[PDB]
């Protein structure tokens, strides 16, 4: 009798865990935990957990845009996250989340691909940002985006040069350079029950027994990068402006967190 | 082109191969030394049992999705999925793999089947899932130990625990057996070896090795040395499990 058991708390303006329908859970990060990788970031929202490792490589660009350094995300929801996943190729949720991360990377414009061209037409960086879920207690997109941003700030790259005599490029793994990022997109999730009840940061069950879900990415300068609204019982702008406000608040909070962290290093 | 992942570049080579330097060599150390170990069981929530082990740059998870319906024919099974995160190691490899992941999976299975007792888990398959977050040396051994912790945590029955240990060979003129080495001592090495045993009843469960060279006596000394190392390591894991059980008793 789960749904009924849950409406009882909902009408008491609470949840069975101790959250006041509009607040998230303990959010934490860890930067630079990993050496084998260029950038590393661990994020965890109480029980939910995510880890991003971003590697850097060389590659030849296309012909439509030689001055574009690729940024390739891939999400991995291995069976150790939850039992709803099985050993094998990626399912549907992993692929959707991957496309979401990519759409974000491309629309928020946190990074200029042009800032990754060494020798146009010949070389350009490729940033393989590999995200991995480890506990799918719910709201994995927020964690994925936040960990991506964190690691993508941690990443500092080397400097390369070209020699015309050898016609080849050399790297200098001693000197390096951080990676400039302009926008700081944060994602805020929502679960819409029957008609009008929007809960924030929904965990697993709350998403299992929900009529719809929503996610909203809110850049710092009062703008939006994505409004992911896959199905649902419906919404009017009045039940949406409130979500946007709360998203701005969450932006502020997590940006303060990330600043404190990058400054505590 | 894979149609279940994002469209990336065809090929991509790392920058190191384009570097110009003689990388630093470790040098000297106490051959019978062990790295500091942080082992904790009970990390993950959504899993019946999980474990995490860190030894130097080595960082490994293991989870156990418990019995899932699927005598000597009504005997349990356990299928193990080893998997190194694409952000471990100097080079990047697509997630799938297909060369060494499966070899190390076979190794884990051959080293776990003995310890675990599957007569009490008939008509069932235990999904063991290892994950290597960072490679910094002895990896397969860490994975064995972590899977053992995760199993003992989920509460699957056993006969004894599994302790692993990795060894290498110094290519110097006087080659000595290097215990619990680093990725540098392992890429600059001649021979490598991996033991895994059950220390109470003193029985190997699965070993492995390889060599630019060697000889009977050397391999034997390596074996016994790894056995002693595993013995010296067992108590850490013991204390970890006790601690996790105490935390569970506290939660309720």
């Amino acid at each position: 009798e789960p749904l009924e058991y849950y409406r009882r708390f909902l009408k008491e303006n609470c949840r069975p865990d101790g959250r006041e329908l509009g607040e998230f859970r303990t959010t934490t990060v860890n930067i630079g935990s990993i050496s084998t990788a260029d950038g590393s970031a661990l994020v965890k929202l109480g029980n939910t957990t995510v880890i991003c490792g971003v590697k850097a490589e060389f590659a030849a660009p296309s012909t439509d845009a030689p001055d574009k350094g690729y940024v390739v995300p891939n999400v991995d929801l291995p069976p150790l996250c939850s039992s709803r996943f099985r050993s094998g190729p990626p399912g549907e949720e992993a692929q959707v989340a991957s496309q979401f991360i990519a759409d974000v990377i491309e629309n928020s414009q946190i990074i200029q691909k042009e800032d990754l061209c060494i020798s146009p037409g010949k070389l350009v960086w490729v940033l393989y940002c590999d995200l991995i879920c480890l506990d799918y207690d719910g709201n994995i997109l927020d964690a994925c985006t936040f960990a991506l941003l964190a690691a993508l700030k941690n990443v500092q790259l080397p400097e390369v040069t070209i020699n015309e005599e050898t016609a080849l490029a050399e790297v200098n793994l001693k000197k390096k350079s951080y990676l400039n990022i302009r926008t700081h997109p944060v994602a805020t999730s929502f679960a819409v029950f029957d008609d009008t009840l929007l809960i924030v940061d929904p965990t697993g069950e709350e998403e299992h027994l929900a009529t719809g879900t929503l996610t909203i990415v809110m850049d710092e300068e009062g703008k939006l990068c994505c409004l992911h609204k896959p199905g649902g019982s419906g919404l009017t702008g009045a039940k949406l402006q409130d979500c946007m406000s709360r998203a701005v608040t969450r932006h502020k909070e997590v940006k303060k967190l990330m600043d404190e962290v990058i400054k505590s290093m | 082109g894979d149609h279940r992942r994002i469209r990336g570049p065809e090929e991509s080579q790392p920058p190191q191969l384009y570097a110009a330097d003689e990388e630093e060599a470790p040098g000297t150390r106490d051959p019978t030394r062990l790295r500091p170990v942080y082992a904790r069981a009970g990390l993950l929530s959504q899993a019946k049992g999980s474990a995490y082990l860190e030894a130097g740059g080595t960082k490994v998870l293991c989870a156990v999705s418990g019995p899932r319906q699927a005598p000597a024919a009504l005997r349990g099974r356990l299928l193990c999925d080893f998997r190194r995160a694409p952000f471990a190691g100097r080079r990047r490899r697509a997630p799938p793999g297909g060369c060494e992941e499966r070899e190390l999976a076979l190794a884990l299975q051959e080293a776990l089947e003995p310890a675990v007792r599957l007569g009490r888990y008939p008509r069932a398959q235990l999904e063991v899932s290892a994950l290597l977050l960072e490679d910094g040396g002895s990896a397969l051994a860490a994975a064995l130990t972590a899977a053992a912790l995760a199993l003992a945590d989920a509460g699957v029955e056993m006969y004894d625990l599994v302790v692993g240990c990795g060894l290498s060979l110094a290519p110097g003129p006087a080659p000595t057996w290097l215990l619990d080495p680093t990725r540098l001592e392992e890429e600059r090495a001649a021979a490598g070896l991996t033991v895994a045993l059950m220390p109470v009843l003193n029985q190997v469960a699965g070993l492995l090795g390889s060599g630019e060279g060697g000889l009977t006596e050397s391999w034997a000394e390596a074996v016994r040395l790894g056995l002693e190392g595993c013995q010296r390591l067992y108590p850490v894991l013991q204390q970890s499990l006790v601690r996790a059980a105490r935390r569970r008793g506290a939660a309720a």
């Binding site: - | 500091p36 170990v37 904790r40 860190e54 010296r232």
Partner: peptide, 11 residues
């Protein structure tokens, strides 16, 4: 062998 602290999963 002595122990250490979690560079990644501290508690």
């Amino acid at each position: 062998p002595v122990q250490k602290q979690a560079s990644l999963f501290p508690d």
